[PDB]
Design an enzyme around this catalytic site. Structure first.
Site, PDB file in Angstrom:
ATOM      1  N   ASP A   1       0.868  -1.172   0.000  1.00 57.42           N
ATOM      2  CA  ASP A   1       0.000   0.000   0.000  1.00 57.42           C
ATOM      3  C   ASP A   1       0.917   1.237   0.000  1.00 57.42           C
ATOM      4  OD1 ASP A   1      -2.255   1.669   0.123  1.00 57.42           O
ATOM      5  OD2 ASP A   1      -2.728   1.196   2.246  1.00 57.42           O
TER       6      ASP A   1
ATOM      7  N   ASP B   1      -0.160   4.794   1.367  1.00 56.38           N
ATOM      8  CA  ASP B   1      -0.429   5.416   2.672  1.00 56.38           C
ATOM      9  C   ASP B   1      -0.274   4.441   3.828  1.00 56.38           C
ATOM     10  OD1 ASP B   1      -1.096   8.218   3.226  1.00 56.38           O
ATOM     11  OD2 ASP B   1      -2.986   7.562   4.088  1.00 56.38           O
TER      12      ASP B   1
ATOM     13  N   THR C   1      -2.822   1.219  -4.497  1.00 54.73           N
ATOM     14  CA  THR C   1      -3.265   2.340  -3.660  1.00 54.73           C
ATOM     15  C   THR C   1      -4.632   2.925  -4.012  1.00 54.73           C
ATOM     16  OG1 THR C   1      -2.612   4.601  -2.981  1.00 54.73           O
ATOM     17  CG2 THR C   1      -1.826   3.867  -5.149  1.00 54.73           C
TER      18      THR C   1
ATOM     19  N   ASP D   1      -1.956  -1.119   5.917  1.00 53.89           N
ATOM     20  CA  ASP D   1      -2.090  -0.609   7.292  1.00 53.89           C
ATOM     21  C   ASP D   1      -3.561  -0.558   7.753  1.00 53.89           C
ATOM     22  OD1 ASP D   1      -2.520   1.587   5.498  1.00 53.89           O
ATOM     23  OD2 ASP D   1      -2.199   2.991   7.167  1.00 53.89           O
TER      24      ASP D   1
ATOM     25  N   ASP E   1      39.542  10.841 -13.985  1.00 54.83           N
ATOM     26  CA  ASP E   1      40.703  10.382 -14.778  1.00 54.83           C
ATOM     27  C   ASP E   1      40.901  11.359 -15.957  1.00 54.83           C
ATOM     28  OD1 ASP E   1      42.751   7.983 -15.300  1.00 54.83           O
ATOM     29  OD2 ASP E   1      41.579   8.144 -17.182  1.00 54.83           O
TER      30      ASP E   1
ATOM     31  N   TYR F   1      53.034   3.125 -17.794  1.00 55.78           N
ATOM     32  CA  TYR F   1      51.960   2.661 -18.690  1.00 55.78           C
ATOM     33  C   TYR F   1      51.659   3.713 -19.801  1.00 55.78           C
ATOM     34  CZ  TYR F   1      48.406   5.642 -16.431  1.00 55.78           C
ATOM     35  OH  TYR F   1      47.699   6.719 -15.966  1.00 55.78           O
TER      36      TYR F   1
ATOM     37  N   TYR G   1      46.120   9.945 -24.838  1.00 54.53           N
ATOM     38  CA  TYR G   1      47.481   9.988 -24.265  1.00 54.53           C
ATOM     39  C   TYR G   1      48.555  10.390 -25.266  1.00 54.53           C
ATOM     40  CZ  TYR G   1      45.640   6.949 -20.462  1.00 54.53           C
ATOM     41  OH  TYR G   1      44.926   6.436 -19.409  1.00 54.53           O
TER      42      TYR G   1
ATOM     43  N   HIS H   1      41.368   3.303  -7.945  1.00 57.80           N
ATOM     44  CA  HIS H   1      41.235   4.185  -9.092  1.00 57.80           C
ATOM     45  C   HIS H   1      39.797   4.356  -9.629  1.00 57.80           C
ATOM     46  CE1 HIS H   1      42.286   6.286 -12.728  1.00 57.80           C
ATOM     47  NE2 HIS H   1      41.499   5.436 -13.391  1.00 57.80           N
TER      48      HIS H   1
END
Lengths: 546, 546
Positions: A8, A10, A122, A184, A334, A382, A465, A523
């Protein structure tokens, strides 16, 4: 055995319940107990509220009817309603106070993750009030986490009418004994029990989850903290902008508010932001998560010079121009973090605020070649391996699953050593053919990266790079400048290449710099520590980017 | 012969010039004449301002330098600067006051439309002030209308240095005698004249345009009112959302601010909003112009029932959900206008405000079949012709250029008679094979529609008319409701099918309804009267949708 769970709104997924606020309003106004709740339900199935809940009338049409039922009820009780009594104000406040009951949503989330079909059922209304956006936002946040949302006002039926339960079972495609129903209100739980569904009468959430975990055999209480919401690629809005004749940029878009442009690193994707996209949108931002040039669905021309910082930044400016955006906040990681510092230095009028994850801002040294500089630090080896065209492409494209499984690992799961890469003859020479799956990634998340990299491979990404000399010359033009717009530097404790100490002198060039720091983070920041990234970014966005 | 035109920003495309505001500030502060302008230029090529204009330093770094030059100049003049003298405040006000000189932009627009290569050449700075967005917005609006933008701070050169003019000629790919150069500073005009360019010293705009029109042989002064800015499809951001497994919706997106969702009619495209998209974005809105289901790049399933209002509205809700939008203002035309009234009636919490062009809101009659209703009005005969699957598709798909040329016409250019369509056996039976081009459309605009319709044809679009009974049943559920959210009805005087009088009783169902009305406007509102559509929509958005 149970395969479905129904909640539900509420008093179950949202607290406090409207019924409960009417109770408090009665007390505050010193009205007879139950007067407002009695007026609310007056006439039962033939009353104003049933018409509202069935979608016959809108909430604004119902307000006068409720006003009259209150007047009528106060007349029978021989009491007076106060001077400035207003149903509009009481109901605006009640709807406004209602917030998601997070542990209940968290349990629904766990059941769905474990194979359950979930639904929201609901009794609700067609909200045409001036402040209707508040509820629209609540429903939007909830609805995305469930397989179905069944609203009384949309189906023309209401709880506790037997028909809505039979409709529920039909939409779930489940037999009653396969469903847990949480409510409820005892009266609305009764038809569900009558059909043979497991039912839970929700009073306090803790007891409700104790009953729910016992019946499902799934742990819902005392669970480890869950990861933030992620993205399903096929559920996102995908955008495409041509920035120049042969170049198109792809992005994923979510949310409304100030534009936040997310820029990934090498060798990544817009998907590297999967855990931030839902969180920043929910926080009040319009997120634009890029596939940077050379990646995923964005164009990947082969020429090295197409990937120098000067051209990349120029294309990001065109990207804003074409989308009609005068500014965006730029968040990078990066290589993306590098780009973002250059946007701030060269186009500060287009940058609302700037944030970098791991990548520090270090001014170019005009008295030293960038290749001399790279050689001075062994953790950068690298980068020299990446220089010669074709070499790193051959190794990284040989086996895509292996590449991504070897790279995307936590600080403790280390499988690569980025020193002596050239000497060893590759990144993976002392790495397994079939690496184990890192705790940060699932097999399906790895396969998404594999599929993205099948389009263009690693030429474009590695070219980022291959402009060391070109970027150095362009960066030297900015040596007299300082970064004076709102800025954030986020360091990652266990990034052994982009070390937190490399960021130590940034304040000389960015005096108003703000900082974040993440302990036990390698990283791959966004996926290593998504919760802590989201916390840092949202707090900074809300204070510095509006 | 001249083929290029170059414009300065300050004092040419933007008024007032900064130089002119410093002059007024001197007067207001009772300072010696020229004191501020003298401090601004102090040191000439070796001074603070040349470093700023070359991009060596940012505007925030330059403010203290200007403060010192003012102090120095006031010392030599033997005067005192006032108590709360502030360069930051003087410059924020000067930059803020600067607005586009519309007749100068209008003339640049005309020259470019007539084959000229246009450019903006300016001495400008890297703006990192907290209020930098004001200038960013000004530059964004201007830059889109020119082939090039040359900024001193980006090229590291400044007017009147001979090098920047030689750079200008190189980027224009033109010889000096082929260029007209417009500048308000004689000293910066001199190098352009020296190279052999035609030059105009801009004092008042009227005299400058008189010199510009005489030299180009193109009428720039006393011209008829131009159309609003349109869209070049390849320059837009294109978005794609999957709303359900086999259904994807395509949209064009431009601008920032409240989301405005534009919904076209039959047989149209997102492109039917070409004249509103730039205008609404410029007005402060985030425009989402749809290709409605069955059209353009959106999916076009063949089943009739995929095009009923209930399913179409449900998909538009999912479209907002997937984009992370709790609301949008919905603006529709023709079938789009129908959809938009149904969004307001069934999902008012997701609709910020609603506007329809031509399509009135008429509640379903529960005591009469919609086919009975359609038959009662002769102007609706074309709708009965559209009923039988395949018939109208064959006629409309036979020759796409003919279809669009015959349909997209002004009230006076009438080529079709929508009464007795069934009896005649088609819409085009008494229409030419090669219709003339309507004044509202160019050949290239027609060809865009032709290309869009080659993908899916007319099955999907015609299916919007094939759910009369289905839409009637769904509409009957809303008969007890009223539309109480902000709403606008725009009637078109000469729409002979969607007549303004069909809208006469809308106030019974939409009490707070606002209205617009366009004289001498046929059915194709957006393209017939774009300027007046833009005016009505912007005024309504700014008062009712925030």
């Amino acid at each position: 055995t149970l395969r479905a769970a129904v909640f539900d709104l509420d008093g179950v997924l949202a607290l406090p319940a409207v019924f409960g606020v009417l109770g408090r309003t009665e007390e505050a106004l010193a009205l007879p107990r139950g007067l407002l709740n009695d007026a609310f339900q007056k006439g039962g199935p033939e009353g104003a509220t049933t018409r509202l809940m069935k979608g016959e009338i809108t909430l604004s049409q119902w307000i006068p009817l409720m006003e009259e039922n209150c007047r009528k009820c106060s007349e029978t009780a021989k009491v007076c309603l106060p001077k400035n009594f207003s149903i509009k104000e009481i109901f605006d406040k009640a709807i406004s106070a209602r917030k998601i009951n997070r542990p209940m949503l968290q349990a629904a989330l766990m059941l769905r993750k474990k194979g359950f079909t979930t639904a929201i059922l609901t009794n609700t209304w067609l909200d045409d009030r001036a402040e209707r956006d508040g509820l629209a936002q609540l429903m939007c946040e909830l609805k995305m986490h469930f397989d179905f949302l069944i609203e009384s006002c949309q189906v023309g039926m209401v709880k506790p009418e037997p028909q809505i339960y039979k409709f529920l079972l039909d939409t779930l495609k489940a037999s009653p004994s396969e469903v847990v129903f949480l409510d409820d209100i005892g009266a609305n739980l009764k038809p569900a029990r009558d059909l043979g569904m497991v039912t839970i009468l929700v009073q306090d959430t803790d007891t409700a989850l104790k009953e729910l975990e016992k019946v499902t055999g799934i742990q819902l209480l005392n669970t480890p903290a869950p990861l933030p919401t992620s993205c399903n690629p096929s559920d996102m809005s995908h955008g495409y902008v041509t920035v120049k004749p042969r170049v198109r940029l792809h992005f994923v878009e979510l949310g409304s508010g100030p534009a936040v442009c997310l820029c990934h690193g090498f060798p990544e994707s817009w998907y590297s932001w999967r855990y931030q996209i839902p969180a920043l949108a929910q926080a009040g931002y319009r997120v634009l998560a890029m596939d940077m040039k050379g990646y995923g669905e964005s164009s990947a021309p082969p020429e090295i010079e197409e990937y120098c910082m000067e051209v990349l930044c120029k294309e990001m400016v065109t990207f804003l121009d074409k989308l009609g955006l005068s500014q965006a906040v730029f968040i990078g990681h990066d290589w993306g973090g590098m780009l973002v510092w250059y946007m701030a230095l060269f186009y500060p009028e287009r940058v609302r605020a700037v944030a970098s994850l791991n990548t520090p801002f270090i001014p170019a040294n005009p008295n030293m070649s960038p290749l001399e500089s790279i050689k001075a630090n062994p953790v950068f080896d690298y980068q020299l391996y990446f220089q010669e065209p074709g070499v790193a492409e051959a190794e990284l494209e040989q086996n895509l699953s292996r590449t991504f499984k070897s790279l995307f690992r936590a600080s403790d799961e280390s499988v690569l050593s980025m020193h002596k890469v050239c000497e060893a003859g590759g990144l993976f020479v002392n790495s397994p053919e079939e690496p184990s799956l890192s705790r940060m990634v699932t097999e399906e998340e790895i396969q998404f990266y594999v599929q993205q990299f099948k389009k263009s491979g690693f030429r474009g990404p590695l070219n980022w790079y291959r402009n060391m000399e070109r970027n150095w010359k362009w960066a030297c033009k900015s040596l007299g400048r300082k970064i004076l717009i709102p800025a954030l530097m986020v360091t990652a404790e266990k990034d052994f290449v982009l070390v937190p100490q490399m960021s130590q002198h940034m304040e000389d060039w960015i005096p108003h710099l703000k900082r974040g720091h993440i302990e036990d983070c390698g990283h791959w920041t966004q996926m290593d520590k998504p919760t802590e990234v989201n916390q840092i970014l949202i707090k900074w966005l809300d204070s510095d980017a509006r």
